[PDB]
Every structure is written in C-alpha cells, then in structure tokens.
Design a protein around this nucleic acid. Structure first.
Lengths: 142, 58, 38, 173, 211
RNA sequence: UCGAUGUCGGCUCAUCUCAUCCUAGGGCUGAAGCAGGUCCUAAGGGUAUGGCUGUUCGCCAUUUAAAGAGGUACGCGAGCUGGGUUUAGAACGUCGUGAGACAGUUCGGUCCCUAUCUACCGUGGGCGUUGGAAAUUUGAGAGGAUCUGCUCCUAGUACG
RNA sequence: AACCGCUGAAAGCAUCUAAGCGGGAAGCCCACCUCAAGAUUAGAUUUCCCUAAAGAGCCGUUGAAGACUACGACGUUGAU
C-alpha cells in the first residue's frame, strides 16, 4: 500500500460561478484560492493541479470593512528611480475592478510555476454577464 | 499529505479533521492516517461510513 | 491659528471641537486664540 | 431632547414615507430627504414622531438629526427661508436678473453667479441682496458661496456680510 | 482630427509685404485615397485609413492588392491611419479622396516625421553632456561619459540612465506650426517651421490639438 | 576588512529625503497698501558667475524668483586630475651632543588593468502567440516634460 | 493636502462631522509627446494562400538608413 498522486491526466476541473456582490474581499479570496488549489478534493497532492475553474461575476461589487475602501493602498514599482506608484482600493475598483480580487487571490496562492498555472485557471468578469454560457458552470455559494 | 486528504474527505462528508480524528479516538478506531487517506482517496463509501461512526461518537 | 501638541482653552469663550480625530480650539471673540493639535 | 420633541405639521403640509424616503408637499414646493435606517417615522394626525429601531447612544444622535431636518423642511415649505446680504463700499453694487446675479467688486471683472435650483434672489436696492429658498441647506450654501467671492475686512468693513452677523473691526496705524 | 500624408520637398522662404522672412517647408500632397473606414462596431474604434503615392504591381503583394481592390483605389507607397470620431467620419467613405483643402490658410498644425538619423552617437551630442577639459592632464576622458552610479549602495546603474545610443531616425512631432499657403491644383501645402525629417520623406500633417 | 575596503579637494555624471530657498495654496499678525514675520500643506520643476586661497568652508563683487539643509564608502580615481595630506632630495625656525624629529614652514617629486558576471545605454538572432502570410492597428503599462522674470493694462484705482 | 465652509445632532445652546452636501495647490491620476500584445492575459481589423501555394530569405544596384545588423527603395514589366 502506497500513497498515490493525482496523475494529472486523470484530474478533471469543474466550472463554478461565484457572485462577489457584497462579500468580504479577503474572506472570499481565501475560499477562491482553496478551490483553485484543489484543497477540497481527497486526491489532493501538492505537486498536481487538482483545483476547479472559478468564474467570478460582480467583481466590482466586492466589499471591504472599515475605512479600507479609502485607506487600503496598492503600491507598485516601475523599475525606474523614484518610480513608486500608489493607488487606492476605490480608484482601483473604478479603473480595473478585477485587479483587486486578482491581487487578493494571488497573494494567497503559492508562488511558482504551479501557482502560475492555478492563477491562470482563475476567471474574473465584471458585471452580471459572463461569456461562459457555453461551459455551463454550476452556481456556487461560499 | 495524509492529514490533508483526510480533511478533504471529512469535509466532503460534513466534518472537519480536528473533529473527525477526535471522533475516531472516542470510537477507539485505531486506523492510521495512511490507511485513512488511502480509503478517502480510493473508496468514498467506506470513508463515509467512518465519518458516520465519528459523528455518532460526537 | 497655532499648531501644537498641547492645546488648552485660554478663556471661557474658547470652545473645544473634534474633527477628523483632531482637536481644535475655536473662539468667536478672538481669531488668534484659535488652535489645532498636531 | 430634539429627537424626543415631536414635529408639528400644518394642515396644508403633508409628509409620506415609502422605500425609506421622506417626501413633504407644501404650497411653496416639494422637498425630499432620505431617512436613516436606525431611525423610524411614525405619522399620527396633526403630528410626526421619530423613534430609533434600537436604543443606543449611536442611534439617538441620528434620530435627533433626522428630526431637525424634518422640522426645518416643514417650516420652510410652510413659509420659506429668507436671508439678507449687505454690500459696503462706494463701488460695490449687486444686480439680480432672473436666476443669475452679477456683483461688482474691487476685481476688474464683474463676478457672475448662477443660483441653484429652488433659490430666488431679489434686490429692492443695489446695496442689499435678498435670497429666498424652499430649504435652509440650499439657502445657506448659496449665501456662503456669494459671501466667498468678497469676504468682509476688519479695517473698513467693506465686503459682503450677513445682516445678523457682526464683523470684527481693526484699526490701522 | 484626421490629417494627411505628404512628401517633404525642402525648405524655402516667403516674403511678407512688410518685408518679413517666413521660413517654410513645402510638402508634396498626392491625393489620399481612403482604403478603409474603421468604426466601433467592427473595429471598436473610429479611424480613416488612407493610401498615398504609387506602387508598382511587382511590389504590391496579393494581400495588399486585394485590400486595395476592395476599396477600389490604386495602390500607394504605404498605408496610413488617422484616429477619427463621429464628426470626422461624416462624409469620408471608402474610396474617397482627401486633398490639401483639408487644411486652410493660417491655422495651426502638428507635423509628425521620421527625424534624420545620426547613427550611433555619444553622450556629448545625444544627451548634451558637458565636455571634459581638453588639457590640464586629461588623458582618455575628453568625451567620456563619466560616472554612471554612486557606489555599493545602490551598486547598480539606474534605469533611464543617459548613455551613448542611436540618435535620430525616430518619430518626432512638432506642434503649433502655421500653414502659409495651400494649392489644390498643384497638390502642394506650405507649412511654417522646420517640419522634422529629411527631404523626400513621408510627413504626417494633422490639425493641432491645442488649437 | 592589514595573503591591501586608495585620502581631501576639483571635473564629469548623477540618485534620493524634506527638517522648503523660489515658485504654488492657507491660518495668525504689533496684517491700512507695498513689503514682510511665524506656522501649516506642498519635493512638480528650478535653485548663478567670478577675486583670494590645494580647499570643502569662509570673506568679498556683481547678479537671481531663489543662489535651500542633507544621505548616497563625508556618492562618483578598473570615469579624469593630482593642487593639499603621506616616501625617497634640499633648506629655514625649533628640539637633541649625535644620528635624527616637528597636525611647523618652503622648492621638487611615475596615478596600471584590452570588462567575464550583474547593472545600464543601443541594436539583432531564435522560438512562441492553437494553419501560414502582407499590412493597419487598440492600449495593460513605461518613460519624457513639469521652471520663471520683466513691461503694459486694470490703475496711480483700492488702501494710505 | 493644509485651510474655509452649508445644514446638523451626540451635548435643547454651540459645532465643517458623527449621517449628508460644498470650495480648495506648481502636488496625485488623466490630458501633451515617445515606446508599448514576450500584455505566455501573447489582443483586434482588412486582405491573400494552401499536392512546396500566399509570402520570406539569399543574391545584385543601393539610401539624408546604418558599427555589423536592421530599416527604406529598386532588380529589364527599371531611374536603384
């Protein structure tokens, strides 16, 4: 008797829809990261991607508690001297509303080639309409 | 790895790992985590029965 | 107005007001006595 | 105390609450505000009472502010709000035509100001300006904006000042 | 905001009746044949595509030949595009003509061109670096770049550092240039200013955004 | 760190902080006006040439809107110089009997390295972009730029 | 941003703030100029071609283009 791996050829990725309207950013991102990593499956092995395809709608309506809408700052560096740029949660959700949840899930997910694959799996769409009618995903509440 | 897989199975059956192991220990079930993970991975119904015993002991 | 760590009323006319988690002293009688904490 | 104080309604004025929005109809005009969730509105003939959903130090304040808003709206719609501005100086004169008022001041270019909706400005004489509004908030904001262009000065008193208000005086030399 | 494509013929001068020199450049303007109209529905943005000049069939590929035949225009020596809006797409349909009468005398224009290429040049020329002393013991550093960083901290050259590079042969735009004269019959436009590039090159003339 | 981490100053080239020199927005004023004084916000740009001295500094002259305070191995010599300091010669004052010595002075006195890696400035080859190709392009994003005097007019009006 | 507010209670008054609504800097993000899909999230549009096709390259004459490259033009149906 040996402990077996998931044999990537045999793993199937299911499609789920998550409505981000009115949910807490971090508390939703933790669950999305867990689903993307595949921690809910009994065949989970750290080196195989066994997670699901998470489609998120109403990404701009994600909520943060306290004064974090006006005080949570996102920094980045351009690589040039003094090239440190800072934006707000509110301005970021106005400009690129996906990037908030994308960044939150990225920070939670592991770093590496396999983490890049799982973050590739993630699908985020603003608004109540998504171009995944063909996939026929399943509504999920979490 | 065994603990992760057992947690996954217990949560599929409606229970967490820290309660499932406690229920095992209260039921006096001596199955090791290696065998428990094997059962969770390759036989869902037997693991469901184990979770039922644990939940009846809790 | 005077910016200082210690702000206290200088007369009865002076009034203490808190805005944006900051301490301000405003008196109608005198403009100079007005103070802010910071 | 203010929250406890019940608002008195004239016979003509009528107030309705639906979908958490308060609407007041009177002869002068119609005024609408948004009710706070902690606060609750009760209508009994000839009177209106405001009470909080939950009893707390946080909610008492909100119910009080809502009561003050509603009392101000009731009396304003019944009679309206009037404010007076005075211009002091040889070269200062104000002329109001229609909804736009032009004020002449020290600056070379004559300042032109457009009043917001629900505000009417009349000038029986150039020196003094009269502003009449349905509601006190708009009246005060418009008066403050008009005052902003040419605030008073303490050496000679020149500028735009409210009749009620008093200007501090300073002596040169 | 749609413009036109011309050829720089060189610089000359215009005398004013008051006796004032006006240095001008003459741009040859062959009729710009509209080859494609772009819109929000099909393309997502609004623009006018034009061709100018002439190209022989041996040099016109089958794909470009079909692209031109769709519009019904004769192949030119290049295809250009102008960002346009609803006002500017009013009367411009595929196969139409844009002439020098797009621009009227006395208005400001912006001219874009490919500046003369100086090749690989040093800091002294390209970045206007101050030259080091010719004498007083100088050895091999008359035109040297000099220090490029400070020390261990940071210990790296910062990005955007000014160093010897290729100079010229880049897109350059000049703004606020008047238009002295327009000739539809000769298809020539006369523009105040340097109008960057060399003579015989292709220059883009557009209305000034500043106005 | 002594089987070696090159000193001060100058030149060239910079990068960052704000405890802001000018510009920009304000409160108070013993703010009549013009000019200021103090403090708050603000680092986007700009923030001199010469005589003396090896000088950093400092004094001076003449300007400027202003001639800011600092960190970066008191930035920067495998980028340059080598005037001072700090070898070997010689001399003055002083100390020592003497050889010699002086954060005392004076004249003179070899500054190496063809760049492997990182970094940076340019410019190409390869493949990829769900058949291939010729063109036109949207823009996630990145960089550049951001300075300011004087004259006239308002008006010799407001103020005095 | 500092600062100045309107209305307004906690705190019958007062109060720029707790709800709500304003003004406000060479500063922040756009707007201006340049680059930009190796943006592996590799996008979009119009044409052309598929039993060595459409095209690309080599080669040759070469350019206000260039270190070599690359880029631009032309090669008898031609002014390179």
């Amino acid at each position: 008797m040996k402990t077996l791996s998931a044999k990537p050829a045999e793993v199937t990725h299911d499609w789920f829809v998550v409505d981000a309207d009115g949910k807490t950013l971090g508390r939703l991102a933790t669950q999305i990261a867990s689903r993307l990593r595949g921690k809910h499956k009994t065949n989970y092995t750290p080196h195989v991607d066994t997670g699901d395809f998470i489609v998120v709608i109403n990404a701009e309506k994600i909520a943060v508690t306290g004064k974090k809408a006006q005080d949570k700052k996102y920094y980045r560096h351009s690589g040039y001297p003094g090239g440190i740029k800072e934006t707000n949660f509110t301005k970021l959700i106005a400009h690129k509303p996906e990037d908030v949840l994308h960044k939150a899930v990225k920070g939670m997910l592991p770093k590496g080639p396999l983490g890049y694959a799982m973050i590739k799996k993630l699908k985020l769409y603003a608004g109540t309409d998504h171009p995944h009618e063909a996939q026929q995903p399943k509504e999920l509440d979490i | 790895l065994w603990i992760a897989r057992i947690n996954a199975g217990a949560r599929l059956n409606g229970l967490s790992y820290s309660r499932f192991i406690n229920g095992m220990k209260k039921a006096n079930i001596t199955i090791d985590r290696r065998v428990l993970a094997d059962i969770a991975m390759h036989d869902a119904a037997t693991f469901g029965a184990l979770v039922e015993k644990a939940k009846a002991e809790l | 107005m005077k910016v200082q760590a210690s702000v206290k009323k200088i007369c009865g006319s002076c009034k203490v007001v808190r805005r944006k988690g900051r301490v301000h002293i405003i008196c109608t009688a005198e403009p100079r006595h007005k103070q802010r904490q910071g | 105390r203010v929250a406890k104080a019940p608002v008195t309604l004239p016979n003509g004025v009528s107030v309705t609450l639906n979908d958490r929005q308060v609407e007041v109809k009177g002869k002068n005009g119609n005024l609408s505000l948004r009710l706070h969730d902690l606060v609750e509105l009760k209508q009994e003939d000839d009177v209106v009472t405001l009470s909080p959903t939950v009893d707390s130090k946080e909610a008492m304040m909100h119910t009080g502010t809502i009561r003050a808003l509603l009392n101000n709206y009731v009396i304003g719609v019944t009679e309206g709000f009037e404010r007076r501005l005075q211009l002091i100086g040889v070269g200062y004169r104000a002329q109001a035509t229609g909804n736009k008022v032009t004020l002449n001041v020290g600056y070379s270019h004559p300042v032109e100001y457009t009043l917001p909706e629900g505000v009417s400005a009349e000038t029986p004489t150039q020196t003094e300006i009269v502003l009449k509004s349905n509601d006190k908030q708009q009246l005060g904001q418009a008066a403050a904006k008009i005052r902003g262009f040419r605030p008073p000065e303490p050496y000679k008193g020149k500028g735009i000042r409210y009749s009620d208000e008093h200007v501090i005086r300073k002596e040169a030399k | 905001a749609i413009g036109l494509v011309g050829k720089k013929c060189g610089m000359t001068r215009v005398f004013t009746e008051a006796g004032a020199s006006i240095p001008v450049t003459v741009v040859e303007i062959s009729a710009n044949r509209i080859t494609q109209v772009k819109n929000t529905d099909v393309d997502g943005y609004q623009a006018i595509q034009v061709t100018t000049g002439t190209r022989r069939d041996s040099r016109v590929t089958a794909a470009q030949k079909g692209h031109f035949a769709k519009a019904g225009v004769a192949a030119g020596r290049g295809v250009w595009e102008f960002r346009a809006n609803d006002s500017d797409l009013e009367g411009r349909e595929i196969g139409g003509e844009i002439l020098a009468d797009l621009f009227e005398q006395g208005q400001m224009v912006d001219v874009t061109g490919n500046s003369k290429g100086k090749g690989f040049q040093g800091g002294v020329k390209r970045h206007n670096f101050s030259m080091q002393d010719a004498t007083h013991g100088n050895s091999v550093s008359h035109r040297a770049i000099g220090s490029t960083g400070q020390n261990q901290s940071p210990g790296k050259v910062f990005k955007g550092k000014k160093m010897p590079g290729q100079m010229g042969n880049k897109r350059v735009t000049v703004q606020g240039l008047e238009v002295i004269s327009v000739d539809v019959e000769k298809g020539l436009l006369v523009i105040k200013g340097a109008i960057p590039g060399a003579t015989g090159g292709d220059v883009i003339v557009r209305p000034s955004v500043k106005a």
